[PDB]
Amino acid sequence: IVWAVKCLPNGDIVSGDSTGQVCIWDGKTYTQAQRIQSHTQDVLCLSVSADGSKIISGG
Amino acid sequence: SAAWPKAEDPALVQELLDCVQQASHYRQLKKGANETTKSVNRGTSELVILAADTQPLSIVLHIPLICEEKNVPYVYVPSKVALGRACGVSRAVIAVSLTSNEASDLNSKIRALRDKVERLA
Amino acid sequence: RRKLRPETIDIQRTRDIPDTHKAAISSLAFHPRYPILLSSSTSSIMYLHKLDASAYPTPNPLLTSVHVKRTDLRRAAFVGPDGGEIIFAGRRRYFHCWNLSSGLVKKVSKIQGHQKEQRTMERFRVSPCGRYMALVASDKKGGGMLNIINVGTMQWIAQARIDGRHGVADFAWWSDGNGLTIAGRDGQVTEWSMITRRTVGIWRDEGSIGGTVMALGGRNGPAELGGDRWVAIGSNSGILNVY
Amino acid sequence: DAIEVAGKVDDVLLTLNRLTKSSAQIIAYNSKMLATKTGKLLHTYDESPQSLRSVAGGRAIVAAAKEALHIGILKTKKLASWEELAYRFVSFDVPDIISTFDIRPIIAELQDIDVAVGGARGAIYVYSNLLAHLHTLRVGTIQPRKYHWHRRAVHSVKWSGDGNYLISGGYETVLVLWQLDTGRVDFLPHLSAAIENIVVSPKGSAYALHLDDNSAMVLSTAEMKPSMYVSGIQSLVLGDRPSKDALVRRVWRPIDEIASPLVATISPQNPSHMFLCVGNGQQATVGGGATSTPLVQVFDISSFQGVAKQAIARTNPTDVNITSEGVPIIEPTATKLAFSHDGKWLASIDEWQPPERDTEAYLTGSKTQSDA
Amino acid sequence: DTHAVVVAPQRLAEIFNAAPAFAMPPIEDVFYQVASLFSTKP
Amino acid sequence: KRAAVSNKNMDLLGESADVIIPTADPGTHPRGRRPKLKPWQKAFRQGRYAAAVDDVLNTTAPSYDPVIALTL
């Protein structure tokens, strides 16, 4: 269950989901580029910095 | 364009072609534009799937009129070659029409599939 | 051997392999340097034969006959251009790498955090450069991934995930050895590079209701897509498209 | 290091010699320069220095204070003459007490370095890029990536080969592997003793571990079995380098001491073997305030290798080594062990009492915790 | 490098069966039709 | 269910073959019976002592044993 999606300024999509992962999806092709296992329970909310330099994930 | 109940979602397109292949093995399928028109005019047709890759698109546009007169659901898939080798034909099939019977798991699948087509409309 | 003409071929049946298998043959492979055929069946036996039709007293004599304990052999492959190691695997959750010099067989059983994703090691492809090896992870769920493993250290280095309906039909490494082309079921084919480590592109097979196999070969192809000229994708209806 | 003096690459030695107790200085020597015992002085830094490592070549050297870290780049390119061997140094404070560090070079030039500092509180701080951060008065904000798994101090941190993985090892007897491309982590959890030192092979294949119970195992990757095992005498040692988790004032600070003699019998019917009582590791033996030696090993005398090992008292290698509070568990010590006349019997005694901090609720009248 | 041109014979039979022997296009035009059929230009 | 070649016929063909590669690690069961952990043993091993003591000392359960309770 993809609880939170947000979009980077350069086009990529950051998505926290039910596994507590944070996936980085490519912007032009819409495929995933990275899976970051971060949390134990599910990531509930994301935030992306205005210049696209920091991602905050809250589970 | 003129293909306004278009099936664009690939999950729904895969469900439509899987039900077409199952009806083709059940011999519950009418392949081709003329045979589709005959089944829709006779009223034995439960659902009708046209293809939008037809190069003159106007050779299948008469079937939406007969389906609007007979109240059967029609839907457009993207690729006629995909529809053709979904039926198991080795030709390009531009319109197919899958029929109903008394009691089948296939008939339950037909009812659910025309519910999904009504969700598209 | 001549350059062959496009309507008839001078194919010529030679002396068949003398040792038969007790089950179906899952995989054949030729050594990249020497004329040595490796056959592997579901009856847990690999046979290495040397191609000698003019041999005596048995044509195509057997070098060795390796029985792997309790593993059916679904696939066996040679590694690299030199053909130094044989990687072989089946339904189980481990795969062996047998070095042909010094004879040691190491049993890789962990894929470094993705052991839950891989309930099998049956289908894999070693790169033509021999550096990498890709294994389809047994996790279908509307889209299949494949974990990519450095051959020399047997460690996870990447993962390529495509979207489909039942996962990955087949895949093939590019000829230069960097990327790989992953043909999933329901027609989506995906070129995925190793340098940028994300998807180069996605295209669709023409009218495929579901793919079954793919192969990729030739030379003088596009330089940024691996340098292989032809891709051939065979579907479940019986139709094979060549692009 | 192998550096180029004029066109002849040769060995330069970089010594770290004290001048006071909390200060030291690093001093370079050639071979002919070592023959005259004058050295090229490079840096004097003044916060209890621990260790010194350098990158391939001699371009960047990394010195380690207790809380700080000194990165040094050589001033000129190509090193024309020997008298211009000067290193520009930048010091910055690591957030924890540095136990170890491994530097990998990002490359035939030297483009960058990646430093992994394993601190004494348990964390591993990865400083990703340093020469491009301190090459440029003003610097940009540098912020290490924190990887915290070990409870006690992390004994060894190393990058692995290609640079995908960060392998590590601490008191918890577990070789851990940070995946570092994902967020994941995979580990070889239950060794015999503490992972006191690791190295990576010249190729990416083998690791070699110096385990705390006097042992070395060359492991191969993803077979993960020891392809080479070498064991020693494993008895109680007064260590030279004291301990890596005696830096931060724990509940029981580990002391180099011998409280009791080693319990050992040479065995008749095979006088080359020697049965002797050992714990899991040396540090895990002496930790807890009592000798916890619930194992014996048979040790060959005629050719000095530890032949075999076995448990006598109850031991749990597969359970957690440390309680929830932070004290290491003690295991029953085999006090008296003596061997029969025939060569066919062996009788041992093992004692265990609960620790003094643990009772606290059995005291009723004049009962102290030692009496309970 | 090139190979032998593969041509289905029904195309050449259509080229010559388009008309009778009399009242066919002149042999230069029919030669250009046959040569463009057997031309190995992609 | 029906396998293609059963493990006993695999053993017979391995007797017929030349070089046998053992895939069981030595010192384990060859058929592959690992000692599986009861959930109180798993909780005690991970360090979940409340769940361990409750799962053991629940006396209504059919897998109740005073010697298991003494062991924990």
Side-chain angles (χ1 to χ4, degrees), chain D residues 28 35 48 78 83 92 113 138 252 287 320:
Chain D
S48 43
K78 308 190 307 192
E83 56 207 359
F92 60 97
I113 56 168
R138 286 179 172 189
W252 178 253
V320 196

Side-chain angles (χ1 to χ4, degrees), chain F:
Chain F
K1 275 297 281 280
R2 186 76 164 273
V5 175
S6 57
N7 281 24
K8 205 166 55 176
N9 312 322
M10 281 188 195
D11 188 17
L12 288 180
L13 302 181
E15 266 320 292
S16 178
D18 285 350
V19 182
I20 306 162
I21 297 187
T23 69
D25 310 296
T28 76
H29 200 284
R31 181 54 75 116
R33 296 185 190 180
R34 282 82 185 258
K36 65 149 183 48
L37 296 166
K38 289 192 274 297
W40 65 268
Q41 279 168 353
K42 195 183 304 185
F44 170 74
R45 185 162 168 273
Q46 295 170 5
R48 228 157 62 245
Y49 307 120
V53 169
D54 275 88
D55 271 319
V56 162
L57 287 185
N58 190 13
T59 175
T60 323
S63 87
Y64 175 73
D65 207 352
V67 59
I68 279 174
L70 176 58
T71 306
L72 178 127

Side-chain angles (χ1 to χ4, degrees), chain C residues 106-110 112-114 117 152-157, chain D residues 160 164-165 177 179 182 184 204-205 207 221-223:
Chain C
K106 49 172 90 65
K107 191 192 81 172
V108 185
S109 77
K110 201 166 163 49
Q112 305 295 140
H114 307 256
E117 294 181 1
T153 85
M154 287 309 173
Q155 273 170 331
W156 186 101
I157 61 164
Chain D
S160 78
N164 303 308
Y165 283 177
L177 285 83
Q179 192 102 32
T182 72
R184 275 186 189 85
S205 158
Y207 300 151
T221 315
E223 201 210 341

Side-chain angles (χ1 to χ4, degrees), chain B residues 34-45 47-52 54-67 70-101 103:
Chain B
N34 295 326
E35 218 173 336
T36 292
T37 318
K38 292 178 227 195
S39 88
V40 172
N41 263 329
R42 287 177 61 247
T44 178
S45 191
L47 199 148
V48 41
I49 293 175
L50 299 96
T54 311
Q55 177 51 52
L57 179 51
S58 283
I59 73 180
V60 296
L61 288 186
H62 64 118
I63 311 172
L65 301 189
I66 310 169
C67 299
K70 297 271 198 168
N71 293 307
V72 290
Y74 62 101
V75 74
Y76 282 69
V77 289
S79 192
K80 57 177 172 69
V81 186
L83 187 58
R85 57 187 69 149
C87 311
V89 165
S90 92
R91 295 299 306 176
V93 178
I94 66 188
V96 78
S97 155
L98 66 172
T99 82
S100 63
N101 277 114

